[PDB]
Design a binder for this molecule. Structure first.
Ligand SMILES: O=c1ccn([C@@H]2O[C@H](COP(=O)(O)OP(=O)(O)O)[C@@H](O)[C@H]2O)c(=O)[nH]1
Ligand SMILES: O=c1ccn([C@@H]2O[C@H](COP(=O)(O)OP(=O)(O)O)[C@@H](O)[C@H]2O)c(=O)[nH]1
Ligand SMILES: [Fe+3]
Ligand SMILES: [Fe+3]
Ligand SMILES: [Zn+2]
Ligand SMILES: [Zn+2]
Ligand SMILES: [Zn+2]
Ligand SMILES: [Zn+2]
Lengths: 309, 301
């Protein structure tokens, strides 16, 4: 068990070699207990652990200890909820608060380079467990996609003197799908996935742990309303991926701005999109619909999720 | 229609808003291999003026999107099922298409790739592969070029040459001209890379004997991947080669094959870790996977 590094790309590989049908995440399961609104608990099959073994060493290759934590965020005690967006605003706020508290703990641990929060949703993208949950990896390395974003963000800031993310968030109007006092959700110009929405704080924040209580309440709303729109823009619930892009631990950055990326994986025609030869083999992406048309369609659908605006 | 560029990653988005049987309108009859224009091209010879926005880089979607119709036979399941002679005709046709793209001198890159399996979205059941002739280098290839060059400056040799010479434990197949191995840095559940033993940068540099031996290495390697998980496995194949049209001492062409079943025969999906973070997980070592693929490969010999 170790973290191997691709010497051509710098990518990391995490090499980590109850009755049937029972839910491991329901209240009363062996590791969950009872009387909780949100539970963060150790992953049964952890990609990273507090006490990783000596890594497998080969002469031409870099290997590092799989030192870290792999956590499951059990989002609600209720098993029969299709999506995060079906939970009340107050419950989503408790989920975000618990994830932030976990990150504050990680920000004390010298071994943690990165706090990666992500969510996979839908049987069609490999999620077999039906209980609402998300994942945290506390890692000894910065995830390669976030490293690339940090390096470009830094170079821009040094070259141009301002945060590029701040400039993008200020400009977004045509592709905006939702905004509140603290958050803007928009289809980026450079969208790659069939329904892609980025959620940014209007104030420059680079760590989840910088967010005020009000910002977290407004975040819960932006997540609920954006995911609600995705659930119906195609007529049936859409599988999606959500990832939090933030600074590395433990210190705020002037040049990087945190954001949630959401990849809705149905085309406008309800056809599932699979990352294949172009995407995985070349890092080339294709769209059969403009980001501008996709923003308009998401925004129209999203009107049916609004309570007062 | 245009190529958009992510300002944070450099990634390019091609924004572009049975047909392959003998007798159909675009195919005709009497052919073994056809290379024809894609009906929905992501790049074209006559792209329109790109959609511009002030903070972003946009490029005209200029190039070619081609379908390689591998056989006139509809009910062939995999490239590996075809006879060596037919696989040689496919590879020869693809190299002839690259020679034209080299001589015409507009394109930056010739990307040859194959998607196989209903489970990864290949609804068309007639065997085919694809070519994108592009005005940009694919970002994954650009990252490999940069790393290959920096190794070359620091060490004086081709890193790919050093890797190929060292591979034994994870070797699944070799012949006079090619080595197929599970890389130490594999990211997909069944991943095999096929390298020429001679340093070659471009598909167009391969001799006829190297093409014949490549047909053999692909047929046998894909035969093994078809059987290793106990049912035919969906896979992605991509050719990583230099940008057009000159070779280099520091970059070495290879095929990467991503077999997308875990050892249990269940589909691996690229999701939040892979697509969100460029982070990859393996529940089996590359070494154990190479042993299983090599064992399966012995039956294919
Ligand atoms: O009893 C279980 C069943 C599942 N999971 C976790 O739920 C996630 C499902 O996704 P996946 O196997 O792809 O995650 P990874 O293991 O790679 O982090 C996995 O991490 C599981 O190990 C768990 O902690 N306990
Ligand atoms: O009548 C058809 C049906 C399909 N295809 C091609 O088969 C490939 C299937 O993959 P995909 O649609 O995902 O490819 P892309 O278009 O993005 O290049 C596509 O290129 C199709 O356009 C075609 O040329 N004609
Ligand atoms: Fe990002
Ligand atoms: Fe490669
Ligand atoms: Zn449950
Ligand atoms: Zn900012
Ligand atoms: Zn056909
Ligand atoms: Zn070489």
């Amino acid at each position: 068990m170790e973290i191997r590094k691709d010497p051509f790309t710098g990518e990391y590989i995490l090499v980590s070699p109850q009755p049937e049908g029972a839910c491991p995440f329901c209240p009363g399961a062996p590791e969950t207990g009872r009387g909780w609104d949100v539970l963060i608990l150790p992953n049964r099959y952890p990609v990273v652990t507090e006490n990783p073994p000596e890594p497998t060493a080969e002469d031409l290759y870099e290997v590092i200890p799989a030192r870290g934590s792999s956590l499951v965020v059990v989002e609600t005690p209720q098993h029969d909820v299709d999506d995060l967006s079906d939970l009340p605003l107050g419950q989503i706020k408790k989920i975000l608060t618990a994830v932030a508290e976990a990150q504050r703990k990680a920000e004390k641990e010298g071994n943690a380079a990165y706090f990666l929060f992500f969510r996979n949703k839908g049987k069609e993208i490999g999620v077999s467990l039906t209980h609402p949950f998300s994942q945290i990896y506390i890692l000894p390395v910065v995830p390669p996609r976030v490293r690339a974003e940090l390096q470009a963000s830094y170079e821009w800031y040094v070259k141009h003197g301002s945060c590029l993310h701040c400039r993008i968030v200020e400009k977004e109007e045509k592709r905006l799908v939702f905004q509140n006092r603290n958050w803007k959700a928009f289809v980026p110009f450079y969208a790659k996935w069939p329904h892609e929405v980025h959620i940014y704080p209007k104030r420059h924040r680079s760590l989840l742990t910088e967010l005020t209580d009000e910002e977290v309440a407004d975040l819960a709303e932006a997540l609920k309303i954006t995911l609600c729109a995705l659930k119906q823009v195609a007529g049936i619930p859409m599988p999606y991926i959500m990832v939090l892009h933030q600074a590395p631990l433990p210190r705020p950055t002037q040049y990087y701005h945190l954001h949630f990326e959401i990849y809705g994986m149905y085309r406008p025609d309800g056809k599932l999109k699979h990352a294949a030869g172009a995407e995985l083999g070349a890092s080339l992406f294709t769209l059969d619909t403009t980001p501008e048309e996709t923003a308009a369609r998401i925004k129209a659908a999203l009107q049916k999720c609004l309570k007062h605006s």
